[PDB]
Structure 1
C-alpha cells in the first residue's frame, strides 16, 4: 500500500524521483538550529549551533532466510458474474460460464470437476516479490561488500562483518548471485486433464526473448555468497511454469537490463488482473530492503540469529480457465490499482518508504521491550488485541503494520488479511540472554560494558551479555508527532539540577528521569560527563553514540536502584560549537529550542543530493479525469490560415494570426 507508507514521511520532506545510491551505507537525517542556554546564580551563558545533524545509519546488509508457507487465496481479479451476493465462488455459475465460452466441448465436464480445487489457488505474491528483487539487483549492482570491514565502532568496543556473517566471501551485489533458469513450457489448449502442482499464467501476445530469461530466474533458488538484503536465501518456487500464450514462447536470451523487468511485471499484472497480489509483494520488500546499523554496541542482539521470511507458495490456475478473467473484474476497494501505478511512475521512492517502516517498527520495539509481563498489553499479547480481522497466523506484515499503527496513532486498513513477509519480534519473545561477539580496542572496556572477562588485553575476541534489548534506532522521521518521555524528542525541554555551595561540585541524582535529561542536554552543549553508580560501582558515559547525539537510560546496561554521583570538576569540552561550564555555584537550569528543519542525506562522508522531477501524491481521480476527458477533441486535421501583412520595408514578409 503506497498510500499508508507515504503518510509516514515528514511534512518538510519534499522527495524527487531519482536517487543515485553508490554505496552500502546511507546516513539519512535533518539539519536543525539548536538555541541552548545555561542559567545559574552567577549569570547566563548562551550558545547556538546553526547546523546540527541528527542521523540514523542504514545499510544494505542483513541475514534473512525464506521458507514456503500456506496462505489464504486472493480472489480479486476473477469476473464478477460467478460471485454470489455474500462474495464467494458460487459453483454452478462457473459451469454456466465455461459452457458459454470458446472452450473445447469434450473438456467442459472434466475441467468443471477440477474447478472446486484449482480456482482457490490464487496467490502470485512470491513471483512478484522475486521479480522486484531482480529489478534492484541490476539497478544498484555496483555496490560492494568487504569481508574485513567495520560493522560497528564506538571507540571502546568494535564489531567486524566477519563476526556476525561467517561463510561470507567479499564480492559486488551483481557478482553475488548466479541464478539457474527454470523451464517455461507452452500450455497446450487441448490437454486432457489439468496438471495440479504446476502453475499456469496468462500473457498478452508473444512472450519476448528477455521475458523468458526473467521468469526463468524469478522461479529459481537464490544461493548468495555475500549477505545482501535484496539477495537473501529463497527456496525454489517451482520446477516448471506453463504460459497460455497462443503466440509461441521465444527461447531464453541470457542477458537483460533493469528496464526489461518493469516490462515483464506490467504485462503479468494486466493479463492476470493481480493488483492486490502486487500490493502484498510491495509491503513485503519494504520491510526487507534495508536493515539498520545498531545505535549502540549492545544493540546488535536483534541481528545475531537470522529472521525467517514467510513467502506464500506459488499457485495460479488462470492458464487452464481463460474465460473466467475478463475486463469486468471483482474488487473490494475502489483504489486497488494505486500501488502498481505509484511504483511504475517512481521506482526509487521505495527506499524512502522502506526506511520509514523500519524506523517506525524498531522505535516501538524499543519501548515495548521495557514493559513487565504481568500486564494487559505486554510483550506476548500486543498483536492479538490490535488485530480486528481473521488472519491464518499473527506473523509477517500483521506484526509490522500493528507497530506502525501504535507509532503514528491511526487505523491501518488492508483489503485481505494476508500474513506474509519478515517477522522481527524473534529475539524479544525468546526472553533469554544473547551472547554478541566483540573485538576490544582499549584495556579499560569491561567497567562500561557487561563483559564476560574482567581483564582483557587489546585485540582479544570477547563476549558481551545483553539481557534487556536497547533501542536499535532513534526517532527522526517520526520526531515530535507522538512524543514519549523515554526518548524525550520535544522541540522545547528544560532540567533543574539543585546544588548548594557547601557541596564542592558533587551532585547525587536520586531521580532517574531528570538524570537522563541532564546527561542528554550536556552532550548537545559538547561536554563529556562520566557518572559513577554508588550501589553497584559501575560507570556510564553520555558519549555512547556518534549519530543521534542523545542519551537514552538503556545506556546504563543495568536495572537496579538509582544513585548516580556526577563530579562537576571533571567535565571535559570535546566537540566544537559548545557552551563552557567553568565553575558552577547554586542551582543550574539547562534549556534548548529547535526552530527549523531541512532534510539531508550523507554517503561515503559526502552529501547525497536528490535529482529528477517533483514527486506528486498520485490519486485514482487524477488519471480517470483524463479518461472522462478521453481527449474528446474530434481527431480531424483542421488547418487554420495566416493573412500576410505588408509594412514599410516590403522586402521582408510578416504573418498575422487572423
Structure 2
C-alpha cells in the first residue's frame, strides 16, 4: 500500500524521483538550529549551533532465510458474474460461464469437476516479490561488500562483518547471485486433464526473448555468497511454469537490463488482473530492503540469529480457465490499482518508504521491550488485541503494520488479511540472554560493558551479555508527532539540577528521569560527563553514540537502584560549537529550542543529493478525469490560415494570426 507508507514521511520532506545510490551505507537525517542556554546564580551562558545533524545509519546487509508457507487465496481479479451476493465462488455459475465460452466441448465436464480445487489457488505474491528483487539487483549492482570491514565501532568495542556473517566471501551485488533458469513450457489448449502442482499464467500476445529469461530466474533458488538484503536465501518456487500464450514462447536470451523487468511485471499484472497480489509483494520488500546499523554496541542482539521470511507458495490456475478473467473484474476497494501505478511512475521512492517502516518498527520495539509481563498489553499479547480481522497466523506484515499503527496513532486498513513477509519480534519473545561477539580496542572496556572477562588485552575476541534489548534506532522521521518521555524528542525541554555551595561540585541524582535529560542536554552542549553508580560501582558515559547525539537510559546496561554520583570538576569540552561550564555554584538550569528543519542525506562521507522531477501524491481521480476527458477533441486535421501583412520595408514578409 503506497498510500499508508507515504503518510509516514515528514511534512518538510519534499522527495524527487531519482536517487543515485553508489554505496552500502546511507546516513539519512535532518539539519536543525539548536539555541542552547545555561542559567546559574553567577549568570547566563548562551550558545547556538546553526547546523546540527541528527542521523540514523542504514545499510544494505542483513541475514534473512525464506521458507514456503500456506496462505489464504486472493479472489480479486476473477469476473464479477460467478460471485454470489455474500462474496464467494457460487459453483453452478462457473459451469454456466465455461459452457457459454470458446472452450473445447469434450473438456467442459472434466474441467468443471477440477474447478472446486483449482479456482481457490490464487496467490502470485511470491513471483512478484522475486521479480522486484531482480529489478533492484541490476539497478544498484555496483555496490560492494568487503569481508574485513567495520560493522560497528564506538572507540571502546569494535564489531567486524566476519563476526556476524561467517561463510561470507567479498563480492559485488551483481557478482553475488548465479541464478539457474527454470523451464517455461507452452500450455497446450487441448490437454485432457489439468496438471495440479504446476502453475499456469496468462500473457498478452507473444512472450519476448528477455521475458523468458526473467520468469526463468524469478522461479529459481537464490544461493548468495555475500549477505545482501535484496539477495537473501529463497527456496525454489516451482520446477516448471506453463504460459497460455497462443503466440509461441521465444527461447531464453541470457542477458537483460533493469528496464526489461518493469516490462515483464506490467504485462503479468494486466493479463492476470492481480493488483492486490502486487500490493502484498510491495509491503513485503519494504520490510526487507534495508536493515539498520545498530545505535550502540549492545544493540546488535537483534541481528545475531537469522529472521525467517514467510513467502506464500506459488499457485495460479488462470492458464486452464481463460474465460473466467475478463475486463469486468471483482474488487473490494475502489483504489486497488494505486500501488502498481505509484511504483511504475517512481521506482526509487521504495527506498524512502522502506526506511520509514523499519524506523517506525524498531523505535516501538524499543519501548515495548521495557514493559513487565504481568500486564494487559505486554510483550506476548500486543498483536492479538490490535488485530480486528481473521488472519491464518499473527506473523509477517500483521506484526509490522500493528507497530506502525502504535507509532503514528492511526487505523491501518488492508483489503485481505494476508500474513506474509519478515517477522522481527524473534529475539524479544525468546526472553533469554544473547551472546554478541566483540573485538576490544582499549584495555579498560569491561567496566562500561557487561563483558564475560574482567581483564582483556587489546585485540582479543570477547563476549558481551545483553539481557534487555536497547533501542536499535532513534526517532528522526517520526520526531515530535507522538512524543514519549523515554526518548524525550521534544522541540523545547528544560532540567533543574539543585546544588548548594557547601557541596564541592558533587551532585547525587536520586531521580532517574532528570538524570537522563541532564546527561543528554550536556552532550548537545559538547561536554563529556562520566557518572559513577554508588550501589553497584559501574560507570556510564553520555558519549555512547556518534549519530543521534542523545543519551537514552538503556545506555546504563543495568536495572537496579538509582544513585548516580557526577563530579562537575572532571567535565571535558570534546566537540566544537559548545558552551563552557568553568565552575558552577548554586542551582543550574539547562534548556534548548529546535526552530527549523531541512532534510539531508550522507554517503561515503559526502552529501547525497536528490535529482529528477517533483514527486506528486498520485490519486485514482487524477488519471480517470483524463479518461472522462478521453481527449474528446474530434481527431480531424483542421488547418487554420495566416493573412500576410505588408509594412514599410516590403522586402521582408510578416504573418498575422487572423
TM-score category of the 2 structures, normalised to the smaller one: over 0.9
The 5 Å alignment of 1:33-182 reads 33-182=33-182
CA displacement at 1:609 relative to structure 2: 0.0
CA displacement at 1:176 relative to structure 2: 0.0
CA displacement at 1:28 relative to structure 2: 0.0
Q: d(CA) in 2 for partners of 1:244 and 1:493?
A: 65
CA displacement at 1:97 relative to structure 2: 0.0
Deviations 1:501-547 (A, max 9, x none): 00000000000000000000000000000000000000000000000
* TM norm structure 2: 1.00
RMSD: 0.0
CA displacement at 1:54 relative to structure 2: 0.0
Q: Secondary structure at the match of 1:333?
A: coil
CA displacement at 1:294 relative to structure 2: 0.0
CA displacement at 1:29 relative to structure 2: 0.0
Q: d(CA) in 1 for partners of 2:627 and 2:19?
A: 32
CA displacement at 1:203 relative to structure 2: 0.0
Deviations 1:586-615 (A, max 9, x none): 000000000000000000000000000000
Q: Secondary structure at the match of 1:311?
A: strand
CA displacement at 1:409 relative to structure 2: 0.0
Partner of 2:571: 571
Q: d(CA) in 2 for partners of 1:187 and 1:37?
A: 75
User: Which consecutive residues of structure 2, in runs of 5 or more, have no partner in the other structure?
Assistant: none
The 5 Å alignment of 1:574-653 reads 574-653=574-653
Q: d(CA) in 1 for partners of 2:248 and 2:76?
A: 28
CA displacement at 1:218 relative to structure 2: 0.0
Q: d(CA) in 2 for partners of 1:45 and 1:417?
A: 57
Partner of 2:560: 560
| Runs of 4+ that moved beyond 4 A | none
Partner of 2:444: 444
Q: d(CA) in 2 for partners of 1:482 and 1:165?
A: 36
CA displacement at 1:414 relative to structure 2: 0.0
Q: Secondary structure at the match of 2:55?
A: strand
Q: d(CA) in 2 for partners of 1:406 and 1:177?
A: 38
Q: Secondary structure at the match of 2:4?
A: helix
The 5 Å alignment of 1:194-233 reads 194-233=194-233
CA displacement at 1:239 relative to structure 2: 0.0
Q: d(CA) in 2 for partners of 1:93 and 1:453?
A: 74
Q: Secondary structure at the match of 2:65?
A: strand
CA displacement at 1:283 relative to structure 2: 0.0
CA displacement at 1:553 relative to structure 2: 0.0
CA displacement at 1:484 relative to structure 2: 0.0
Q: Secondary structure at the match of 2:454?
A: coil
Q: d(CA) in 2 for partners of 1:84 and 1:509?
A: 69
CA displacement at 1:630 relative to structure 2: 0.0
CA displacement at 1:61 relative to structure 2: 0.0
CA displacement at 1:570 relative to structure 2: 0.0
CA displacement at 1:277 relative to structure 2: 0.0
Deviations 1:345-404 (A, max 9, x none): 000000000000000000000000000000000000000000000000000000000000
Q: Secondary structure at the match of 1:163?
A: helix
Q: d(CA) in 1 for partners of 2:247 and 2:336?
A: 30
Q: How many residues align?
A: 658
* TM norm structure 1: 1.00
CA displacement at 1:3 relative to structure 2: 0.0
Q: d(CA) in 1 for partners of 2:407 and 2:209?
A: 47
Q: Secondary structure at the match of 1:217?
A: helix
Deviations 1:77-118 (A, max 9, x none): 000000000000000000000000000000000000000000
Q: d(CA) in 2 for partners of 1:394 and 1:318?
A: 29
Q: Secondary structure at the match of 1:402?
A: helix
Partner of 2:278: 278
CA displacement at 1:458 relative to structure 2: 0.0
Q: d(CA) in 2 for partners of 1:371 and 1:249?
A: 58
CA displacement at 1:493 relative to structure 2: 0.0
CA displacement at 1:180 relative to structure 2: 0.0
CA displacement at 1:254 relative to structure 2: 0.0
Q: d(CA) in 1 for partners of 2:222 and 2:469?
A: 31
CA displacement at 1:244 relative to structure 2: 0.0
Q: Secondary structure at the match of 1:56?
A: strand
Q: d(CA) in 1 for partners of 2:21 and 2:495?
A: 42
CA displacement at 1:448 relative to structure 2: 0.0
CA displacement at 1:13 relative to structure 2: 0.0
CA displacement at 1:7 relative to structure 2: 0.0
Deviations 1:209-256 (A, max 9, x none): 000000000000000000000000000000000000000000000000
Deviations 1:269-319 (A, max 9, x none): 000000000000000000000000000000000000000000000000000
Q: Secondary structure at the match of 2:415?
A: coil
Partner of 2:316: 316
Q: d(CA) in 1 for partners of 2:203 and 2:244?
A: 7
Q: d(CA) in 2 for partners of 1:359 and 1:90?
A: 44
CA displacement at 1:647 relative to structure 2: 0.0
Q: Secondary structure at the match of 2:486?
A: coil
